[PDB]
Amino acid sequence: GNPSGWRTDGQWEHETLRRAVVHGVRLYNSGEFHESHDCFEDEWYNYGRGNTESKFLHGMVQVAAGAYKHFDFEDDDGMRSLFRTSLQYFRGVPNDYYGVDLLDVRTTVTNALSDPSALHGWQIRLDGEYPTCRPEDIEFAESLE
């Protein structure tokens, strides 16, 4: 099918949101967790509060930030706290949103609450695969604010 967020004119409803997803997921998948977080964090206030867009983005910020606490600092309590709120933000978000396999995100992040090693070598599925960092993704994260 067409994932949620895809319009009938063959465009994403919010281009800058899809952008954040592409760069963020590719950064995440190459283990650049801080840069990933920053791609999401750049977009996360642009839609206000309480709606699908802003809920998805807050969730992904916290996924990135939770990974970062786990891999960079071995801070599992910090990871666990972010993961618990990320799951609440994802409530109500379609499981295919903007090309992300969000169902797998939610179940892996849920797993990690029990066992942080659920994260090890885990990559986020986007458009049915596992895209990784390209020079333009890191360039974009570095161009941020």
TrEMBL record:
Signal peptide from the UniProt entry: none
Pfam families: DUF309 (PF03745)
Matches recorded under InterPro entries: DUF309 (IPR005500), TTHA0068_sf (IPR023203)
Top-level taxon: Archaea
PANTHER family membership: EXPRESSED PROTEIN
Protein name: DUF309 domain-containing protein
